[PDB]
Amino acid sequence: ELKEKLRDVMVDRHKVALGKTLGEGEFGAVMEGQLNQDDSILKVAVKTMKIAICTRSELEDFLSEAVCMKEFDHPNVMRLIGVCFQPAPVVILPFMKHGDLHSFLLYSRLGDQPVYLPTQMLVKFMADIASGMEYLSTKRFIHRDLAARNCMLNENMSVCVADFGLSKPVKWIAIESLADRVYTSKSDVWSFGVTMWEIATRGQTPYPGVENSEIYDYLRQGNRLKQPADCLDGLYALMSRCWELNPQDRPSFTELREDLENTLKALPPA
Ligand SMILES: Cc1nn(CCO)c2c1-c1cnc(N)c(n1)O[C@H](C)c1c(ccc(F)c1Cl)C(=O)N(C)C2
């Protein structure tokens, strides 16, 4: 009656086969994996969190969030496959062969094979995040860790929002969230403005030369991310609106999706 949701979210550790490591972190390790989906085998991403559970309430909260994340059904939102325990929690996600959005933007210029991404492709990436964020907003979900690095690329080169701040940096957090530790969908809008800038600059570091400890004062003194020379006044106006001091002055994710889609049809395809 109650735990019928635990039945779905749980994944048998004897059906998961680890392969090559995809990357290392401070919060865990991620590997390429094979999931025995009874009759079929599925290529997955396996994130094992280095930080183990120490209380019943911590184990309770993880499993609640996991059920919330498995309920996500949108083309621009990562669909959580399931959860394990190595107790250290494990997370099973679909295998996204094109990797994270930040790495893609960063390798486009700073790679051995440097290809210039057209403004329309960049505006579509932004539109893809706002669509997934509009979905999460309606489902009353707060991401808390929105960034190009936490955005995945589908096989159709479509972007989808991922992570969902489950491992709960500063340069994406809204001014009110740095100050009061209060998080809303309006603070997610701020983070999205930073992400749009991250896409427009093609993976540049927000606030260069500013340290995380200086960030609150830098923002508090009125400073915001400067407009890129190659970026359109209209696109930068959308960014700036997300960084408005008063959260109620910031646009909604439905508003952003519309303005981004409007500018996208005006631009060349595809
Ligand atoms: C194929 C691949 N190459 N690379 C490195 C180049 O991008 C990665 C992946 C990969 C693929 N599919 C997944 N579902 C997946 N990871 O999920 C991770 C848990 C994940 C990240 C990063 C951000 C983020 F949003 C998530 Cl969900 C990660 O740790 N990576 C190592 C990214």
UniProtKB/Swiss-Prot annotation:
Upregulating conditions: (Microbial infection) Up-regulated by Aedes aegypti lymphotoxin beta receptor inhibitor during Zika virus infection.
- List each copy of the Protein kinase domain by range: 16-264
| Residues recorded with modification Phosphotyrosine | Y236
What is its subcellular localisation? Cell membrane
Superkingdom, natural source: Eukaryota
User: What happens to this protein after translation, modification-wise?
Assistant: Monoubiquitinated upon GAS6-binding. A very small proportion of the receptor could be subjected to polyubiquitination in a very transient fashion.
Which intervals lie on the Cytoplasmic side per UniProt? 1-270
Tissue expression remark: Highly expressed in metastatic colon tumors. Expressed in primary colon tumors. Weakly expressed in normal colon tissue.
Entry binding sites for ATP: L22, G23, E24, G25, E26, F27, G28, A29, V30, K47
Q: Which residues form the active site?
A: D145
Tell me which family the UniProt entry assigns to this protein. Answer: Belongs to the protein kinase superfamily. Tyr protein kinase family. AXL/UFO subfamily.
Known disease link: AXL and its ligand GAS6 are highly expressed in thyroid carcinoma tissues, and might thus be involved in thyroid tumorigenesis. Overexpression of AXL and its ligand was also detected in many other cancers such as myeloproliferative disorders, prostatic carcinoma cells, or breast cancer.
Free-text function comment from the UniProt entry: Receptor tyrosine kinase that transduces signals from the extracellular matrix into the cytoplasm by binding growth factor GAS6 and which is thus regulating many physiological processes including cell survival, cell proliferation, migration and differentiation. Ligand binding at the cell surface induces dimerization and autophosphorylation of AXL. Following activation by ligand, AXL binds and induces tyrosine phosphorylation of PI3-kinase subunits PIK3R1, PIK3R2 and PIK3R3; but also GRB2, PLCG1, LCK and PTPN11. Other downstream substrate candidates for AXL are CBL, NCK2, SOCS1 and TNS2. (Microbial infection) Acts as a receptor for lassa virus and lymphocytic choriomeningitis virus, possibly through GAS6 binding to phosphatidyl-serine at the surface of virion envelope.
How is the subunit organization of this protein annotated in UniProt?
Answer: Heterodimer and heterotetramer with ligand GAS6. Interacts with CBL, GRB2, LCK, NCK2, PIK3R1, PIK3R2, PIK3R3, PLCG1, SOCS1 and TNS2. Part of a complex including AXL, TNK2 and GRB2, in which GRB2 promotes AXL recruitment by TNK2.
What protein am I looking at? Tyrosine-protein kinase receptor UFO
